[PDB]
Each structure stands twice: as C-alpha cells, then as structure tokens.
Amino acid sequence: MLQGLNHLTLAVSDLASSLAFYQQLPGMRLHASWDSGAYLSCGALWLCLSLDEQRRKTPPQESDYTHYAFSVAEEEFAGVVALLAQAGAEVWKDNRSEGASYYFLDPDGHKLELHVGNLAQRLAACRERPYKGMVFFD
Amino acid sequence: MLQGLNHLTLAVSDLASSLAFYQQLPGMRLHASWDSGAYLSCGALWLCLSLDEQRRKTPPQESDYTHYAFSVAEEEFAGVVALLAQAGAEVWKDNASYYFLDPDGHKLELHVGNLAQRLAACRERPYKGMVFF
Numbered sequence: 269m270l271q272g273l274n275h276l277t278l279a280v281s282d283l284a285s286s287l288a289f290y291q292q293l294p295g296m297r298l299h300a301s302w303d304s305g306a307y308l309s310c311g312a313l314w315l316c317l318s319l320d321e322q323r324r325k326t327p328p329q330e331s332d333y334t335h336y337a338f339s340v341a342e343e344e345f346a347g348v349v350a351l352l353a354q355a356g357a358e359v360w361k362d363n364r365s366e367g368a369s370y371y372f373l374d375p376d377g378h379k380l381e382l383h384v385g386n387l388a389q390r391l392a393a394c395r396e397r398p399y400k401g402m403v404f405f406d
Numbered sequence: 407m408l409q410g411l412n413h414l415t416l417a418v419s420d421l422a423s424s425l426a427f428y429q430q431l432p433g434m435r436l437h438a439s440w441d442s443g444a445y446l447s448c449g450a451l452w453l454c455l456s457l458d459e460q461r462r463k464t465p466p467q468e469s470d471y472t473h474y475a476f477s478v479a480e481e482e483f484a485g486v487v488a489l490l491a492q493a494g495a496e497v498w499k500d501n502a503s504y505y506f507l508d509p510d511g512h513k514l515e516l517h518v519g520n521l522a523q524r525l526a527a528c529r530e531r532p533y534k535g536m537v538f539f
C-alpha cells in the first residue's frame with residue numbers, strides 16, 4: 269500500500285522570496301524552479317513551492333495549529349536556533365517540555381517547526397508520563 | 407544541516423471522525439491517541455492529528471493549493487484508488503496522481519513517482535521558463 273510522504277507542496281505568494289528562505293537558511297538542495305513553482309529537496313523529503321496567487325501571508329493568530337516539522341541533529345540545534353533568531357524568523361510558540369523543539373513560520377505564514385527526536389523516542393517518553401487519556405496500540 | 411521531514415501535524419475539529427479516516431482507509435499504523443490528539447505512522451513518515459477547536463472543515467474552494475502527498479506503489483494504485491472512490495472521498499483535482507481531501511478539508515494527494523523521476527520527465531519536456539541546477 270502506501271509507502272510514505274511522496275512530496276509536500278506549499279502555496280506561496282512571492283516565489284523568489286519564499287524559495288530564497290528555504291534555499292538559504294534551512295539550506296534545502298534547490299533542484300529546479302520555474303515561473304510558477306520550485307522543487308527543493310531535503311534527503312528523504314521532497315518539497316514543492318507552488319506559486320498560488322490566493323495565498324495571503326496569514327498571521328499565526330489567524331491560522332490553525334497545522335504545521336510542518338523538520339528533523340535536525342541534536343548537536344546542530346543551537347546553531348540553527350540562532351540561525352533563525354538572528355535572521356529574525358518569527359516565532360509562534362515556545363515549545364514547553366515535550367522535548368527540544370523550536371517553532372517558527374515562513375514568509376507566507378506557514379507554521380514550521382524544528383524538532384529533535386523520532387516517533388519512537390516520543391512514544392517511549394509518553395510511556396513514562398502520558399497525556400490526558402492516552403492509549404497505546406503498537 | 408537538517409535531515410528530512412520529522413513529522414506532520416494536522417489540526418482537526420472532530421477527532422473521532424478524523425482518527426478513523428487515516429486509520430481505516432489508508433494503511434496508517436495508529437500508535438497512540440489521547441483526548442486532544444493522536445500519533446500515526448506511515449513507514450518513514452510520522453503523522454500527528456492535533457485536536458484544534460478553531461479548525462473549520464473548510465471547503466477546497468476556500469483553501470490554497472497547499473496539500474500533502476503520499477507515495478503508493480504503481481501496482482497498488484487502483485486498490486487504494488478504489489478504496490477512496492468507493493468510500494466517497496471527495497476530490498479537488500486530477501491531471502499519475504489522485505487529489506482528494508480529508509474530513510476537515512485538508513487537501514491530500516496520492517502520487518506514484520519520486521522527485522528523480524519527475525526531474526527526469528521535466529528534462530524531456532520542461533515547463534514555462536524552467537531552470538535546473
């Protein structure tokens with residue numbers, strides 16, 4: 269059946285501005301781009317920045333919790349944390365407990381996240397102190 | 407330096423309805439769930455359905471092109487295509503890919519082919535003003 273996430277398409281108003289974001293600060297190997305989109309890659313992940321003229325740069329106050337996270341090495345956390353803080357990448361939550369994570373947003377207001385830890389490490393941590401009404405399955 | 411997509415969190419109004427969707431129709435291995443969220447898996451992918459009370463089930467006409475795709479075997483295409491076509495999963499685009507949506511209006515996609523196969527296809531017939539690297 270389904271293998272995994274094939275690609276991720278993000279609607280962006282300004283293409284040049286948004287693609288510069290992902291190309292420079294996160295440094296996703298920009299494969300190709302054209303007049304109405306761009307393809308970027310990040311190892312197993314495939315990112316597509318499709319130009320949509322109906323995408324207003326929505327503030328986090330006017331957006332739902334839907335966000336997109338990225339896997340970064342634990343050692344390389346502070347480095348990329350400053351990378352966004354020094355570049356003025358805006359924040360939308362502080363991430364209290366739950367591990368080590370830094371929440372932020374892109375130019376067009378797509379809520380993003382930098383996280384250290386896989387699902388297995390999260391599930392193990394929850395077995396210690398679980399959430400409200402948490403149930404396991406395996 | 408940072409590796410691939412760590413996880414994907416989706417805001418959902420009704421949890422019970424949403425949790426059933428990904429668990430039953432797709433082959434998402436539901437790991438855990440609680441009063442305001444759930445953890446599901448899809449091989450290398452980690453999916454989180456967070457319960458948001460500010461998430462209206464938005465129609466596709468009132469949503470941007472931002473969507474999330476899934477890799478499915480070419481042979482197993484019709485199988486999961488039938489599963490959604492028979493279950494009445496509403497579609498929003500079609501032009502090998504199958505575009506549909508979740509209960510809360512999150513635009514989704516079923517695609518066969520990786521980026522390398524796509525980049526090769528563009529090297530044959532490229533888009534308007536396409537530039538490669």
Ligand SMILES: O=c1[nH]n2cc(-c3n[nH]c(-c4cnc5c(Br)c(=O)[nH]n5c4)c3[N+](=O)[O-])cnc2c1Br
Pocket residue numbers: 275276277304305316318533534
């Ligand atoms: O009539 C025409 N329509 N048209 C559209 C495009 C186009 N622009 N961006 C994308 C595109 C590419 N890749 C992706 C991905 Br991957 C994704 O998720 N969205 N997406 C859009 C496409 N497309 O072929 O789908 C080019 N030529 C034409 C002609 Br000629």
Ligand SMILES: O=c1[nH]n2cc(-c3n[nH]c(-c4cnc5c(Br)c(=O)[nH]n5c4)c3[N+](=O)[O-])cnc2c1Br
Pocket residue numbers: 366399400413414415442443454456
């Ligand atoms: O006072 C309290 N507030 N509170 C919130 C939660 C909670 N609800 N959803 C998530 C959640 C989990 N995992 C994830 C992921 Br993975 C993700 O992307 N979002 N996300 C949210 C959490 N959380 O553990 O952060 C639990 N306990 C409490 C207490 Br006690």
Ligand SMILES: [Zn+2]
Pocket residue numbers: 275277475515
């Ligand atoms: Zn797509």
Ligand SMILES: [Zn+2]
Pocket residue numbers: 335337381415
């Ligand atoms: Zn998160």
